[PDB]
Enzyme design. Structure first.
Site, PDB file in Angstrom:
ATOM      1  N   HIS A   1       7.142 -25.739 -12.272  1.00 17.04           N
ATOM      2  CA  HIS A   1       5.929 -24.967 -12.616  1.00 17.04           C
ATOM      3  C   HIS A   1       6.187 -23.963 -13.734  1.00 17.04           C
ATOM      4  CE1 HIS A   1       2.077 -23.418 -12.164  1.00 17.04           C
ATOM      5  NE2 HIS A   1       2.164 -22.789 -10.991  1.00 17.04           N
TER       6      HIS A   1
ATOM      7  N   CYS B   1      -4.737 -23.558  -8.558  1.00 18.70           N
ATOM      8  CA  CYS B   1      -4.951 -22.248  -7.915  1.00 18.70           C
ATOM      9  C   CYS B   1      -4.330 -21.228  -8.865  1.00 18.70           C
ATOM     10  CB  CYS B   1      -4.326 -22.221  -6.526  1.00 18.70           C
ATOM     11  SG  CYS B   1      -2.521 -22.381  -6.582  1.00 18.70           S
TER      12      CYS B   1
ATOM     13  N   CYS C   1      -1.676 -18.999 -13.686  1.00 19.85           N
ATOM     14  CA  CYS C   1      -1.267 -20.388 -13.324  1.00 19.85           C
ATOM     15  C   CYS C   1      -2.214 -21.437 -13.971  1.00 19.85           C
ATOM     16  CB  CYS C   1      -1.198 -20.530 -11.794  1.00 19.85           C
ATOM     17  SG  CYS C   1      -0.349 -19.170 -10.905  1.00 19.85           S
TER      18      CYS C   1
ATOM     19  N   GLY D   1      -2.799 -17.082  -9.048  1.00 20.22           N
ATOM     20  CA  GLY D   1      -2.424 -15.741  -8.554  1.00 20.22           C
ATOM     21  C   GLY D   1      -3.550 -14.735  -8.775  1.00 20.22           C
TER      22      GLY D   1
END
Lengths: 401, 400, 401, 400
Positions: free
Chosen positions: B356, B386, B89, B388
């Site tokens: 996203h 943030c 991400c 994963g």
């Protein structure tokens, strides 16, 4: 000048396609090295800033950020982030370069950096439908080769396979099959001599694999790709891969599994812990070339790295040029004005003998050059790989002790 | 202190899954941006040192080093190298960080850095046989989610999907469903306000796509994922994706197609060509956290980057925390001691509205924070995502 | 009364999954038998009307009409048509039934009929996209089991696997695990005795397979599935496949490769050529039952076939009931009022020993019953298989000589 | 002489590839017809002996014995068996032949027989690994064409695709491009004439399909593949698919979805229930030919079936030769000594107009010949299809 120091490193043995390491996940193979270095470096695991791994595939067990899957699976702390890098064949060198740049900027004191590739365990890949009940299926082996090629790229640059680019460089820079085979034989011979001298002892972490049966384990201690029987005579017999070509199964590297990791840090953390580094990273360079002549990538990357490092090629005691194809190594050597049999060049063998697990090879070259620098008079080594689709990456290092 | 300047940047509109950009190859999406910046920056294309692209997938048309394939296919010169980066991400932000560090070291004067994803065009992936005539076939969608999960990872850290980590964070840091849905409402309303004020005009490069009628083309100028109709009352009506959970299809970002690229260089190359930079990159920080609570990665990332930039959170005028799930943003805000409604936070809207495309998002936050900073008084912005499996990445920038 | 005669037949050995026949294409395995019967029957190849083969899969090398691909690949004339039939487990018996009906109607004097299955070489199957860039992938192993199941069928009938239907029949008709294992042991023992007596000599065509290495061939002469070491004692130890269940890996048949073909004709062609048949086909019957109790299929098919044939079960000298699961065979025997150890039942072993290459098994039962009839006092044999999704197929034959 | 009667029958409309029936599972397509005939024939469902369906694929939703899955899913009783038959292009006719032979032998009084294909929904098929970590993957579309071809077959007989066999036949029997295109024109014109005269009304069961708008259904009543606009002038303008070839996208049938089923029984079951049959099945013949020339299969099939029925081609009032490719029909007509324009031949149109769902086509020719016979004076019809890999199947029927 970069200001990053190589403190330690380890690699797995490099396995053949469907060979000695074909049962080991690429995240587990990297995880073994990350765990062993964390446990034996002398540094505090909490000083580790980040893990950076090269991997050219990332479709499989190496997907969703190999570096972070690998450090978690190996039992390193959740607090330790990671990142996976891809510059095809130069991936393992580019990860070390990225860690060295972070360090030189003051963003972290200590990094694990390398590469890993399981070309055995590389998945098949299948394109999504562009329309309901579409009949076109594009299915590819991710082990190696072009998949989902861009027609705009192919129209400008062609569709030459990597072996075909070796034949191109052989034609372009006038490298004979005889010289290629002489270089391939001496790669096997130099591997065999280094093995006999004990050169690889502190470089390889042996890997426990399932031996089949049930409960049976076997220890993989040794590189599986070398062919010591490949003398000039045997290589001269082999067919070209392509008609009018110079590249063969014998003077080309192969498809392989392997991982390689180094521990980098600033000078100050080693001074504080009383741990001496092997070598300093001085400089790197990346260049693009014509995709069809990708194998001469290293000539310009090496010259730019030496220029950034402020040294001359004659001050260099040790040259690791990755042996993708014997004719591209000879072409680089010719363009740098060096003899084909320069004793500084891959003096403990190269990828013709050891194999070419794409993401790991550039990290093996960093570790083997830092270790090899400890046995010679001159202070400097250069490490360089040619890259698929036409790139060269080079790095200069300096012995510390 | 990093010493890299953001000179320019462009992003595609962000598409919905199987949406307005589903026909565009991810290398072509990235390539369009690489070519337009190469042609209009005012810098010589020959001073570009490297192209660094974030991409979380790299199994499909984005495979075999997206950066290099994108720059060749777009017609940038063969002399220009490229590399692809994956920190899930945070991929697009990590590409900019790596280019900034390169520049800060004196290794090249000019970089193109960002990210791209076609979550529409992500392929299926299929395991090799582990024995002749094996009947075991592991097949996965590379679009999103765990594939070929490691058994030793699952045993230590669990198998929670990203929405579940949202619920875990909500539960752990006590974030009400109502607060989550208000944040999601504010993101949609803030996107629509900025859209009508013309904020996105010079941020987006429109993309020409096939309409499918034997030669017919359509220009995509607008983000496709925004839902203006999504007010607080509509969001409270939707169900949680999991029982006991506060995360819905409406307070979570989506699955999306898109690309974002910035031009970074040293100060001297701007001065030599008479081109002013938008902002300076001061610092970055990457941290790991418990995978189960991956959403609060930003907290320590943000504090370390601020400490590295030598500034207080009070000197910040603009905060881009990626909206993976409304509740992880609010948890990060509570952990930093900020009101849920602090107007510095995603002021032009966020991933709940915009979507996203994983690789592209961090590159979008750099570009939009650099643009947003030009309009406000305080001279510092923080960008954070943030990640994963439990990471946070943050960058601090200063208006020039 | 049907009026078709069995003149000849042959089968391959039945190989284990990834075993002795895993390198042989199902069309080549059927082609070997079709070629050998054409060459050795005594009949003119030009009198052949048609080739009819059972095959439950047809996704792979067995696709696009196995029968016609098989006869062409084996070098039979282009003038000879073929057809492939699918009634799952009864496919090889249904092909013989269809040939027997053609003959009895006067449409052709001579047919080759049987079945073939390569469960080793069965492909993976992948559903087309229902919409552009669909994320749903349905991927199935076609080797065995439900693929692309109809939700309307599953809602009415459930999703019980074949082994689970065995547990159902065991529960429904009160068959104990002990009786199942006693039947499984006697299948292995009866195979071993028949092998020792030479019973299989004229029934099996051995198959030349690649032995690996290079140029190396090996001759597969023998059925590979039998486990003579599986006595009652060893079978009693094995775990159930499901909790509270009676079916095990030992009292169930397995996954197998194999082909079996018979040559059928009218009486007149044999009279004209001076060739005597083994047996006459009298009658067949097909029934449906509840999918969940599919294993009792044979009870009603056998009663209807005997009724159409005008004979009583006590006139039958030989009963081949396919041994899918020991508990479904015992359940059929119980419903027919026969003892579990009736010596007429699979007297040379069944599928527990020999395996179950789905499409071939019903054709093996036709050939082994015609051959077995030659060694006993009574004139009649019945052949029967249970079928996945709840069917029974039975056929009555009569010894000629 | 066979002794089976055709009592009733229905077919779906035939859909284009990814067309009006692409959402219907092939078992459901067959099941709709099985259920409607079970409910409206006037026979007791309990006298049905077996369901026999032709299907050339059987890899997908049509897998694991389509007949049985179709009759269970449609709600026919569990007591009713079924079997699936594959003779490629003659599959649906071969299913009816096998049911007719069964009846003629006294093995059941009543059969449902026909064929079904969803060439839209045909899956991809993928070879098993022949060694651990094999890099060889053979992947094919089961929709149509050779898959996992046998090397020993290719060596003796070649690898010609079906359109090429059309060109081979044209070349071998001297069929002009002009004659082919006129035949293709006549088929479209003959379909449109029969459509406006109401010929298809009681032949087609309309199918209700999803339109996709969250609950919206559409009724498909009409064959989707016909091209009324395709006149002789339009067809002459299209290119051959292969150089030197006479076969085009316009004088060849297409790729299609559809099902067709007939109810067959003995005479006595009709007499006992007071239901008259449409026609009697008199005879069938299957022949092999050179795969290269598969198109002329019908010639010997037709002559053997006529000799078995004990009639001359002059007693025939209706000839259904399947239109795989205009030139193979014309070659069959020349070989039998019939004018290219004989009005007994595909008088209500053919596969060039209607399409070719492979399994279903032969079952459609039985049904339409049985219906067509009711309208004309001569009391005999022949039905015939050519078969890939070189077969011909023909059936002779008599109006009752």
């Amino acid at each position: 000048m970069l200001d990053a120091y190589i403190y330690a490193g380890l690699r797995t043995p490099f396995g053949r396609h469907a060979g000695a390491l074909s049962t080991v996940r690429p995240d587990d193979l990297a995880g073994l090295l990350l765990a062993r270095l964390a446990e034996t470096s002398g540094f505090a695991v909490d000083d580790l800033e980040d893990v950076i791994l090269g991997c050219t595939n990332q479709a499989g067990e190496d997907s969703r950020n190999l570096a972070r899957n690998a450090l978690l699976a190996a039992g390193l702390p959740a607090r330790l982030p990671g990142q996976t890098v891809n510059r095809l064949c130069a991936s393992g060198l580019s990860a070390v370069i990225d860690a060295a740049r972070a360090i030189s900027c003051g963003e972290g004191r200590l990094y694990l950096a390398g590469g890993a590739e399981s070309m055995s365990r590389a998945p098949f890949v299948m394109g999504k439908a562009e329309s309901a009940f579409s009949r076109t299926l594009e299915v590819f082996d991710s082990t190696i080769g072009a998949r989902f090629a861009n027609p705009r790229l192919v129209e400008r640059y062609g569709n030459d396979s990597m072996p075909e680019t070796g034949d191109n460089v052989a034609r372009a820079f006038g490298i004979a099959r005889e010289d290629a085979d002489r270089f391939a034989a001496s790669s096997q011979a130099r591997y065999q001599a280094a093995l006999e001298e004990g050169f690889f002892l502190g470089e390889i972490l042996p890997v426990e694999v399932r031996a089949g049966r049930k409960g049976e384990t076997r220890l993989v201690e040794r590189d599986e790709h070398p062919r010591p029987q490949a003398d000039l005579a045997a290589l001269a017999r082999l067919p070209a891969l392509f008609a009018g070509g110079v590249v063969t199964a014998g003077n080309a590297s192969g498809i392989n599994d392997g991982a390689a990791v180094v521990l980098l840090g600033d000078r100050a953390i080693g001074e504080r812990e009383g741990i001496r580094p092997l070598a300093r990273i001085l400089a790197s360079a990346s260049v693009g070339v014509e995709p069809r002549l990708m194998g001469i990538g290293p000539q310009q990357a090496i010259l730019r790295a030496l220029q950034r490092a402020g040294i001359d090629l004659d001050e260099v005691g040790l040259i690791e040029i990755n042996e993708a194809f014997a004719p591209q190594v000879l072409a680089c050597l010719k363009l740098l004005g060096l003899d084909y049999e320069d004793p500084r060049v891959n003096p403990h063998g190269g990828a013709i003998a050891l194999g070419h697990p794409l993401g790991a090879s550039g990290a093996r070259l960093v570790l083997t050059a830092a270790r090899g620098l400890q046995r010679i008079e001159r202070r400097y080594a250069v490490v360089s790989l040619c890259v698929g689709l036409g790139q060269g990456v080079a790095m200069v290092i300096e012995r510390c002790r």
